[PDB]
Design a protein around this motif. Sequence first.
Motif, short mmCIF file in Angstrom:
data_model
loop_
_atom_site.label_atom_id
_atom_site.label_comp_id
_atom_site.label_asym_id
_atom_site.label_seq_id
_atom_site.Cartn_x
_atom_site.Cartn_y
_atom_site.Cartn_z
N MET A 196 0.82 -1.20 0.00
CA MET A 196 0.00 0.00 0.00
C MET A 196 0.85 1.26 0.00
O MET A 196 2.03 1.26 0.38
N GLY A 197 0.23 2.35 -0.42
CA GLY A 197 0.70 3.68 -0.10
C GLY A 197 -0.07 4.27 1.07
O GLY A 197 -1.02 3.69 1.61
N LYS A 198 0.37 5.48 1.46
CA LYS A 198 -0.37 6.29 2.41
C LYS A 198 -1.77 6.59 1.91
O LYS A 198 -2.72 6.63 2.70
N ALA A 235 -3.88 3.45 2.53
CA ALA A 235 -4.21 3.33 3.95
C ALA A 235 -5.29 4.33 4.35
O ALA A 235 -6.25 3.97 5.05
N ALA A 294 -8.57 3.13 2.91
CA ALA A 294 -9.00 1.92 3.60
C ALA A 294 -9.64 2.25 4.92
O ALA A 294 -10.62 1.60 5.33
N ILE A 295 -9.13 3.26 5.60
CA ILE A 295 -9.71 3.62 6.89
C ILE A 295 -10.98 4.44 6.71
O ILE A 295 -12.01 4.15 7.34
#
Lengths: 48, 48
Positions: free
Chosen positions: B18-20, B23, B26-27
Motif C-alpha cells: 500500500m501507499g499512504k 491506507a 482503507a480507513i
Amino acid sequence: TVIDQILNINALHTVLRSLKNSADSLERGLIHAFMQTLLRKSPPQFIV
Amino acid sequence: YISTQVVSAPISYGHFIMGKENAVTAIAYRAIMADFTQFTVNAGTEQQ
C-alpha cells in the motif's frame, strides 16, 4: 504495512493521552477531596 | 509431439505494498482503489 503502522501509532497515542487524562484526573481529585474535607470541617457562620 | 524446452519462468513472488493513499482510503471509506496513483495522475489529461 501502512495500515499496521497507522494502528500502531494510534494505539500509542490512545495510551499516552489516556495517561495524561489520568494525571489531570488525579489533580482534580486532589482539588475535590480537599474541598470535601473543608466542607466537612467548616461550621456555619451563625454558629461561629 | 512431446518435447522439452527452456522457458523463461518467474522465480519470486510479486509485490503489492500500500501507499499512504491506500491506507487513508482503507480507513475512511472501507475500500482500496488499485492503481490509485496512476488513476489519480491521469485525471485531467486526455489519456483518462
